[PDB]
Every structure is written in structure tokens, then in C-alpha cells.
Design a protein around this ligand. Structure first.
Ligand SMILES: CCCCCCCCCCCCCC(=O)O
Ligand SMILES: CCCCCCCCCCCCCC(=O)O
Ligand SMILES: CCCCCCCCCCCCCC(=O)O
Ligand SMILES: CCCCCCCCCCCCCC(=O)O
Ligand SMILES: CCCCCCCCCCCCCC(=O)O
Ligand SMILES: CCCCCCCCCCCCCC(=O)O
Ligand SMILES: [Ru+3]
Ligand SMILES: [Ru+3]
Length: 582
């Protein structure tokens, strides 16, 4: 186009343009106040209207990176608050924009965004609605810089739907709090999911990411031919390559072009895209990525007719090992939408290792005749782990299930810090809360997706604090081996039990008057130090104690005398559990 700003101002809208421009300058100017960005956003949008009224006005034909970088150097505090980033303004445009992406700080040093009371949020949301959503959007963007700016706009529109519906209701906290926590746990999961694909691209190479894209696209698009899925995997690998680079316009255009090809080839990809392709350009890439798995033709035959019993299997493989193996991922994923994508890569590696061993023998057909028999143990292993834990989640509650995990995983790796073991077991319990509530045809894709972000969060906290060698080995291993590595952990026999500290196992009358979240944290934090003090404690002993602690809380909180009860009964509970866990 003759003017980049005029075009993007048209096919996005003025309300969407000012929002993205705010997120743009918030991720680069993470130290300027909110009033400065509003000054810049209003100066940019007023300039954008000049190019809409005339495509040949002052500096309208310039590039967006030039207009973005020109505004980036207008700030006077650029030399003081960022300093080194101000040096980028002395380079040419193809390097200046590259200079700005490097000096972007991933993890700044800002306070946490404290969630205030519902009354003060519904008053600010009602008094001045626009600046309320923009300020908090400016606070999320300045703390998550590499977050995809358009996708961050999709969450802000969801928050707006939570206030308009709940801030005029009965107990607004009953309407809003289960929604803000939903949007937080989902928003933090999206921030960690896209950050994981960048690590998996530079650690496992370009080939490993393509195998993952082959298995998920063919799973999502079973009616698509292998040539069409292979074409999409190449474009998909290019998108996440340049989106992880840090550039917004470079990543926004690649995703927009990919969505246009998918919408122009719905007859050879999927039939579920009618609704997604109706949406405008901003929502195309987001809708398509979350489209439901299409139905398989159901008339598909077995895989032994082309990969086992057929002739020239070693010939079709040796001619192109990556093309032949990718078909095995294609032909197996679209016939198993219930398998996790990581599980399908585990089967293809089994098929890959078998062909490299059988085709080097005298009689190949007799060798790999049992290649499909090796898949059943690898497939039953995650299915049985889903069955064991979901049945445990059916008996116990969600809270009682978290404690079962908190005891099981503390005895395996007792060296991990207590606050880490708590947040892990509670986030891990949230996985079974919604994945076990799905049928068996969706349990493994659910568990794979949430375990991927929870296990990676564990490895992030363990990377900045080396604690256990067994945890480091599982965090360093491959993608198909990461989750089985954690499931293969056993009880640490070399662990010396931690010395007793009475201050930890002392409880005061404040737990009678804490929120349900704070109460569950303290009951579980004390359960970790209880196991770390006596790791060889059997479960029947822990059925007690925890029941003696249940009566200890009901005896002190309900009595007319508090604080004093925690001193008398607190000594009885501790000392009785001393001889109970002998
Ligand atoms: C993403 C952009 C969200 C803008 C609206 C935020 C509303 C919630 C305000 C902070 C409360 C919280 O931390 O959850
Ligand atoms: C002057 C700052 C400009 C910041 C970027 C404004 C235009 C963003 C366009 C985003 C298009 C998204 C396409 C897509 O993901 O489907
Ligand atoms: C042109 C399409 C190429 C698709 C290549 C897929 C190859 C998958 C082989 C199995 C990979 C298992 C993971 C690994 O070996 O690290
Ligand atoms: C629910 C809690 C986790 C239960 C086991 C999850 C199994 C994940 C299967 C996907 C995989 O690791 O290959
Ligand atoms: C701290 C917890 C480290 C282990 C994470 C386990 C993730 C889910 C594995 C399921 C299983 O135990 O079989
Ligand atoms: C030897 C120290 C004894 C006192 C500490 C015991 C800690 C028990 C924690 C119980 C947590 C679960 C409570 C519940 O079921 O709601
Ligand atoms: Ru965050
Ligand atoms: Ru993606």
C-alpha cells in the first residue's frame, strides 16, 4: 500500500488501533508512566487520521518500523530511564528496529499487579470505563513484553465482558472472582505456552518442531492430504520462527498471510473453518489456531497395508526418511485424535528405530512384523496414569487430591523448597480438575497441554535455583521423555530427614479467620515440612495426624477461647505425632 498506517487503520478500526499502539509502546517503554503512552497513542492516532484523509500527506508513505522508531526516539527520558536503548536511535532503519528488539527487557523489576477489592474495581470501571481497561492493559503489557500484542487484546476484551456482567449483579465477587482467576490461570498459561515453543525451537532444532506440527495439524485436519499438511507445516515452522524473533509487524503479517491461504483452501483443509474465516483479519489467526478437530473419514483402513505388510517399505523409507516418517505421523495422528501429540512422536520414534534396525538385516519383513506390538505398552502407559489419577480425583475432592500429590511428590524429591512443592501440587491438581471432567477421547490432549506449562514452570523455578540432580535430568531431557522422566521418579532413600523445628508446626488463631486460599496454603505448607521431617512415614499414620489436626482446628476455632487453645492443644498435637511417626 501507499501508506502502511492508513491501511492498518482501516482494516483494524480506530478502537483496535489505539489499543495495539498502546501495547506496542508498553512493551518497549516499560519504564514510562501511563500518561506518557496516552500522549504517544493520541499523537500516533491523530497522525494516522492524516493518512486516512490523504494517502499522500506528510510522512505517510514511510514504513511502519520507521514511524514506530521515530516515535520511540521522541521521548526525552530515553537517555535516562533506558539509556542503552537510546543508542539505537543513531543507526539506520534496518538496524535500528533490530537494535530495539534486543534491548527489550524480558523480566523487568516491577511490582506485582495487586488485585484490589471488587468494590473499588466496579467503581473505577463505572466512573471512567476506557482509562480503566487501558491502564491495566498497559500494566499487563509492560510486564509481559514478548507477549503477542494482538492476542493480549483478546484477553482485555474478555475482562471487559467480566466487569459489564458482574459489576451489576448480586455478589459481584461470586461472579467476578471465579472469572478473574480463570482469566489469570489461562492468561499465565498462554504466556508460558508461547514462551515454550521458542525454547523448543532453539534447543531441539527445526526438525523436531516440524514433527510436532505434522502430528497436530493432521490431527486437527484429518481430511487434509499429506501434501497439504506438509505445506502448512512449512509455513507454520516459518511463523513461530519469526514470531519468536520478537518483531510484532513481522509476526503479525506472517500469521495474517497464513490465515488467508487457509481460508482460500478450506475445501482441501477442513470444513470447521466457515465461522473462523468469517471473522476479520485481527481474529483470523486466533480463531483458526483454536478450531476444533475435524471429523475423520471413518472409512480409513489399517496402517499395516502400507507400513508393515506392504512391499518396498524399506525402499520408500530409505528413499526419503523424513518424508516417509512424516507420513507415519500423518497417517497415525488423523486416526487418533485422542492421543497426545507428544505420544504420537513417541510412536514415530519407535517406528524410526525399528526401520533403522530391520532394513539393515537380511529378511526385513520378518523383523519389523512386531512393530505395532511395541506401540501398545507406550500407549497404555499414559492411559493408565490418566485412569489411576482421575479415579483418585473421583474419590477425593479437588483439595484432598492436591494433598495426595503433595505427599507423593515430596517423598520422591524432598530437596525442593517448600513453597515450590505447594504451588506445583496445587497447579497440578487443577489439571485433573478439568481434564478428568473431559471424556476419554479428550483426556490425553487436555493433560498434555496443561502438564506442558506446569512442568515447564517447575523447570523455570528450578533453573534459577539448582536443587536436585534428578529434577535437572528430567528438565534437560527431550520433549517425548520429559513427562515420563517425572513419572519415573522414585522415593529418595538417600535423603536425610530434616531436623524438627517447633516454630514451623505452631499454628495461631489467624487460620480460623483466613481466606479459603490462605487456609489451604498453610495446611499444605505444614504438610510438606511434616513429610520432610519424617519421610518414611506411612500413609495410615498420615491419615491420622491430619485427622487429629482437623479436630485440633475445630476444637480451637469453635471454642469461646482462641489463641490460648492453640498453645495447649498445639503441644498435645505435636507431641502425640512425635511418637506416632516413630
Ligand atoms: C489483559 C488486559 C486486562 C485489562 C483488564 C484487567 C482487569 C483486571 C485488573 C487487575 C486484576 C487482576 O490482576 O486480575
Ligand atoms: C504504530 C504502531 C503500530 C503497531 C501495530 C499496529 C498494527 C497491528 C496489526 C496486527 C494484525 C494482526 C494480524 C493477525 O494476527 O491475524
Ligand atoms: C517433510 C515433513 C518432515 C516431517 C519429519 C518428521 C520426522 C519425525 C521422526 C520422529 C521424531 C522423534 C523426535 C526425535 O527424534 O527427536
Ligand atoms: C492428570 C494428571 C496427569 C496424569 C498423566 C498425564 C499423562 C500425559 C500423557 C501425555 C504424555 O506425556 O505423553
Ligand atoms: C514436583 C513434581 C514433579 C513431578 C511432576 C509430575 C507430573 C505428572 C506426572 C504424573 C505421574 O506422577 O505419573
Ligand atoms: C508433627 C506435626 C503435627 C502437626 C502438623 C500436621 C500438619 C497436617 C496438615 C493437614 C493438611 C490437610 C488438612 C485438611 O484436610 O483440610
Ligand atoms: Ru505473568
Ligand atoms: Ru502455534
Amino acid at each position: 500500500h501507499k501508506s502502511e498506517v492508513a491501511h492498518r487503520f482501516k482494516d483494524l478500526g480506530e478502537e483496535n488501533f489505539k489499543a495495539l499502539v498502546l501495547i506496542a509502546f508498553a512493551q518497549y517503554l516499560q519504564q514510562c508512566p501511563f500518561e506518557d503512552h496516552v500522549k504517544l497513542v493520541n499523537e500516533v492516532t491523530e497522525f494516522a487520521k492524516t493518512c486516512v484523509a490523504d494517502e499522500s500527506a506528510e510522512n505517510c508513505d514511510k514504513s511502519l518500523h520507521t514511524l514506530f522508531g521515530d516515535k520511540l526516539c521522541t521521548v526525552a527520558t530515553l537517555r535516562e530511564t533506558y539509556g542503552e536503548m537510546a543508542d539505537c536511535c543513531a543507526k539506520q532503519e534496518p538496524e535500528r528496529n533490530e537494535c530495539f528488539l534486543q534491548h527489550k527487557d524480558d523480566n523487568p523489576n516491577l511490582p506485582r499487579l495487586v488485585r484490589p477489592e471488587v468494590d473499588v474495581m466496579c467503581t473505577a470501571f463505572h466512573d471512567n470505563e476506557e482509562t480503566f481497561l487501558k491502564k491495566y492493559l498497559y500494566e499487563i503489557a509492560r510486564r509481559h513484553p514478548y507477549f503477542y500484542a494482538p492476542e493480549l487484546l483478546f484477553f482485555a476484551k474478555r475482562y471487559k465482558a467480566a466487569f459489564t456482567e458482574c459489576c451489576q449483579a448480586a455478589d459481584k465477587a461470586a461472579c467476578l472472582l471465579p472469572k478473574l482467576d480463570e482469566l489469570r490461570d489461562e492468561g499465565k498459561a498462554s504466556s508460558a505456552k508461547q514462551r515454550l515453543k521458542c525454547a523448543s525451537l532453539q534447543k531441539f532444532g527445526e526438525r523436531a518442531f516440524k514433527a510436532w506440527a505434522v502430528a497436530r495439524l493432521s490431527q486437527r485436519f484429518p481430511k487434509a492430504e499429506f501434501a497439504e499438511v506438509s505445506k502448512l507445516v512449512t509455513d507454520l515452522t516459518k511463523v513461530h520462527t519469526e514470531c519468536c524473533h520478537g518483531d510484532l509487524l513481522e509476526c503479525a503479517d506472517d500469521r495474517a498471510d497464513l490465515a488467508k491461504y487457509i481460508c482460500e483452501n478450506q475445501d482441501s483443509i477442513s470444513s470447521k473453518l466457515k465461522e473462523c474465516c468469517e471473522k476479520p483479519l485481527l481474529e483470523k489467526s486466533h480463531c483458526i489456531a483454536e478450531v476444533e478437530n475435524d471429523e475423520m473419514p471413518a472409512d480409513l483402513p489399517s496402517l499395516a497395508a502400507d507400513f508393515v505388510e506392504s512391499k518396498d517399505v524399506c525402499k520408500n523409507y530409505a528413499e526419503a526418511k523424513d518424508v516417509f516418517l512424516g507420513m507415519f505421523l500423518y497417517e497415525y495422528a488423523r486416526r487418533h485424535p485422542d492421543y497426545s501429540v507428544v505420544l504420537l512422536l513417541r510412536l514415530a520414534k519407535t517406528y524410526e528405530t525399528t526401520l533403522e534396525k530391520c532394513c539393515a538385516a537380511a529378511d526385513p519383513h520378518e523383523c519389523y512384523a512386531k512393530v505395532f506390538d511395541e506401540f501398545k505398552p507406550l500407549v497404555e502407559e499414559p492411559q493408565n496414569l490418566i485412569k489411576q489419577n482421575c479415579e483418585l480425583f473421583e474419590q477425593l475432592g479437588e483439595y484432598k487430591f492436591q494433598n495426595a500429590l503433595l505427599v507423593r511428590y515430596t517423598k520422591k524429591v524432598p530437596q525442593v523448597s517448600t513453597p515450590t512443592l505447594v504451588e506445583v501440587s496445587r497447579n497440578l491438581g487443577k489439571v485433573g480438575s478439568k481434564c478428568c471432567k473431559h471424556p476419554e477421547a479428550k483426556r490425553m490432549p487436555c493433560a498434555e497441554d496443561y502438564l506442558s506449562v506446569v512442568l515447564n514452570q517447575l523447570c523455570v523455578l528450578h533453573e534459577k535455583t539448582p536443587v536436585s540432580d534428578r529434577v535437572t535430568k528430567c528438565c534437560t531431557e527431550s520433549l517425548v521423555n520429559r513427562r515420563p522422566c517425572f513419572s519415573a521418579l522414585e522415593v529418595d532413600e538417600t535423603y536425610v530427614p530434616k531436623e524438627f523445628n517447633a516454630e514451623t508446626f505452631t499454628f495461631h488463631a489467624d487460620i480460623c479467620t483466613l481466606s479459603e486460599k490462605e487456609r489451604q496454603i498453610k495446611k499444605q505448607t505444614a504438610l510438606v515440612e511434616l513429610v520432610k521431617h519424617k519421610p518414611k512415614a506411612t500413609k495410615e499414620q498420615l491419615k491420622a495426624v491430619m485427622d487429629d489436626f482437623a479436630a485440633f482446628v475445630e476444637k480451637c476455632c469453635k471454642a469461646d477461647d482462641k489463641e490460648t487453645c492453640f498453645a495447649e492443644e498445639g503441644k498435645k498435637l505435636v507431641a502425640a505425632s512425635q511418637a506416632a511417626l516413630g
